[PDB]
Amino acid sequence: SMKIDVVTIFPEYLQPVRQSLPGKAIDAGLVDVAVHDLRRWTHDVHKSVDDSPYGGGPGMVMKPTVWGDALDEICTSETLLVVPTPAGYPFTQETAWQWSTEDHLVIACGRYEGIDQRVADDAATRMRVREVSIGDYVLNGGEAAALVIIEAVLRLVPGVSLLEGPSYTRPPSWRGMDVPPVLLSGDHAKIAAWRAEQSRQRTIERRPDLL
Amino acid sequence: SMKIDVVTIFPEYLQPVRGKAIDAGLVDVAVHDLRRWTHDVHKSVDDSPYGGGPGMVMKPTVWGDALDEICTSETLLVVPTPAGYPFTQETAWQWSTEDHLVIACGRYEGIDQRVADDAATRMRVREVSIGDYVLNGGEAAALVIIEAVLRLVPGVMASLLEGPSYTRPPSWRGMDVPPVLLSGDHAKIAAWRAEQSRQRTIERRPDLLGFDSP
Ligand SMILES: COc1cccc(COC(=O)c2cn[nH]c2)c1
Ligand SMILES: COc1cccc(COC(=O)c2cn[nH]c2)c1
Numbered sequence: 001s002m003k004i005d006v007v008t009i010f011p012e013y014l015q016p017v018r019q020s021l022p023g024k025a026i027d028a029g030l031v032d033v034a035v036h037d038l039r040r041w042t043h044d045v046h047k048s049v050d051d052s053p054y055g056g057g058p059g060m061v062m063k064p065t066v067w068g069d070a071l072d073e074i075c076t077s078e079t080l081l082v083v084p085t086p087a088g089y090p091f092t093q094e095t096a097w098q099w100s101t102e103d104h105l106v107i108a109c110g111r112y113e114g115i116d117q118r119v120a121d122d123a124a125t126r127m128r129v130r131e132v133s134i135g136d137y138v139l140n141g142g143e144a145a146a147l148v149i150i151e152a153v154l155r156l157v158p159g160v161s162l163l164e165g166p167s168y169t170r171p172p173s174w175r176g177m178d179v180p181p182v183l184l185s186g187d188h189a190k191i192a193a194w195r196a197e198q199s200r201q202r203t204i205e206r207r208p209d210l211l
Numbered sequence: 212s213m214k215i216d217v218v219t220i221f222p223e224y225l226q227p228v229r230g231k232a233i234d235a236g237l238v239d240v241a242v243h244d245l246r247r248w249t250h251d252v253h254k255s256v257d258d259s260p261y262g263g264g265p266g267m268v269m270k271p272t273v274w275g276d277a278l279d280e281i282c283t284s285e286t287l288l289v290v291p292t293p294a295g296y297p298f299t300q301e302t303a304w305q306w307s308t309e310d311h312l313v314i315a316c317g318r319y320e321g322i323d324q325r326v327a328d329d330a331a332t333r334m335r336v337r338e339v340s341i342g343d344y345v346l347n348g349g350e351a352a353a354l355v356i357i358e359a360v361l362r363l364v365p366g367v368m369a370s371l372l373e374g375p376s377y378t379r380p381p382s383w384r385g386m387d388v389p390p391v392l393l394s395g396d397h398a399k400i401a402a403w404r405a406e407q408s409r410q411r412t413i414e415r416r417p418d419l420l421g422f423d424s425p
C-alpha cells in the first residue's frame with residue numbers, strides 16, 4: 001500500500017502515470033497517485049509561484065511561502081519528501097528499492113533555478129527529505145524526473161554491477177544477421193558464460209566507470 | 212528547427228510533450244504507434260528470448276519496418292536503455308544541433324540487438340542510459356531526453372552542483388536568508404556561492420571532484 005502525491009504547476013503532465021496504473025492495483029489499495037496544482041496554494045491574484053533570487057543572477061526561485069503551505073497540507077510526519085533536482089544525491093536502482101516500501105511519497109516538482117532552500121530545510125525538521133538527481137543533465141522542471149522516479153519505484157512494488165548484453169528473438173536470421181548460435185545450442189552453462197563475457201565487454205566499452 | 216519522431220507501443224504516454232510547447236515552430240514532435248507496422252492478427256511486437264531468460268524481447272521485424280519508413284541516413288537514432296552509454300548534459304548540447312532525432316522506446320526486457328546493428332549500417336545510432344535505474348519502458352526516458360535537448364535548441368551548467376537558492380521574504384518561519392545574499396556585495400556573493408557549490412558537490416557527488424563514491 002503506497003500513496004504518492006505529486007505537486008506541480010503542470011498537473012496535466014502527470015496524467016499518463018495516473019492511467020498507467022492497473023485497475024486491480026488501485027482497487028486493492030496498493031497504490032494511489034494524486035497530482036496537485038501548486039497554484040492552489042498561491043496567495044495573490046496573479047497566482048505567483050516564483051520570485052527573483054536573492055543575490056541577483058538571471059533565473060527565478062520558487063517561493064517558500066507557497067511551497068510551505070502546500071507541503072503543510074499534503075505531508076505527514078511519515079512522509080518521504082522527494083525533491084528532484086540536478087543538484088541532488090544520485091537516484092539509483094538501490095534508491096528505488098528502498099523507496100518501494102514507503103507508505104507515503106510526496107514529490108515536489110520544482111522549476112529551473114530551484115526551490116527556496118528553506119522549504120526543504122524546514123520540512124526536514126519533521127519529515128524525511130531527499131533531494132535527488134535522476135541524471136547529470138538539466139530539465140526545465142522536475143515533472144519528467146517525477147515520472148521516472150514514480151515508474152522506477154512502482155515497478156518494484158509487487159502488483160503495481162555489470163551491464164546486460166544483447167538479447168535476441170525470432171527469426172534466427174534477419175537482414176543478413178544471425179542469432180548467435182551458442183544461444184540455440186541447449187548448453188545452458190555455456191550460454192551463461194557467453195552472456196557474462198558479452199556483459200563484461202559491453203560494460204568496458206560503455207561504462208568503464210563500473211569497473 | 213528540428214524534427215523529433217518517437218516510436219512506442221504506448222503513444223498515449225507521450226502526451227506530456229504537449230510542457231515544451233513547440234508552438235514557436237522551432238521543433239515538430241511526432242509520436243508513432245509501433246503496432247502500425249505489424250501484419251499479425253493480434254499485432255504481436257514481442258517474443259521469448261533466444262537462450263532463455265526472463266520476460267520478452269521486442270521482435271526485430273516490426274521495428275525494422277518502422278525505422279525504414281521513419282529514418283533517413285541523416286537521422287540520429289536514439290535508443291534509451293539502462294545498458295546504454297551515459298546521456299549527460301554534454302550529450303544534450305551535442306544533440307541540440309541535430310536535424311532529426313528518432314527515439315525508439317523499448318519495453319519488456321529489450322529490443323532484439325539486430326535492430327540497432329542493422330540501423331547502424333545506414334544511420335548514426337546511440338544507445339543511451341539516462342541513469343542507473345530500470346524502467347518498464349523507454350517512454351519516460353524519451354520525455355527526459357526531449358526536455359534536456361529542446362531547452363538547448365537555439366531560439367529557446369556542468370562540472371559541479373549548484374548551491375542553495377533563496378527569494379523573498381528575507382525571514383520565514385524563523386529561518387533567515389544568508390546575510391551575504393542580502394549584502395549587495397557581488398564579490399562576496401560570488402565567493403559564497405562558489406563555496407556552497409563546492410561544499411555541496413563534495414557532500415553529494417564526490418565523484419565529480421575526483422573522490423571515491425560513498
Ligand atoms: C528543484 O530544483 C530544480 C532546479 C533545476 C531543475 C529542476 C528539474 O529537475 C531536473 O532538471 C533534474 C533532476 N534530476 N536530474 C535533473 C529542479
Ligand atoms: C550498475 O548500474 C546499473 C543500474 C541499473 C541497471 C543497470 C543496467 O541494466 C541493464 O543493462 C539492463 C536491464 N535490462 N536490460 C538491460 C546498471
Ligand SMILES: COc1cccc(COC(=O)c2cn[nH]c2)c1
Nearest residue numbers: 292293317340341342346348349
Ligand atoms: C531498449 O529497450 C529497453 C530495455 C529495458 C529498459 C528500457 C527502458 O529504458 C530505461 O529503463 C533506462 C534508460 N536509461 N536508464 C534507464 C528500454
Ligand SMILES: COc1cccc(COC(=O)c2cn[nH]c2)c1
Nearest residue numbers: 086087136137300369370372373
Ligand atoms: C555534472 O553533471 C551535471 C549536469 C547538469 C547539471 C548539474 C548541476 O546543476 C545544478 O545543480 C542546477 C542547475 N540548475 N539548478 C540547479 C550537474
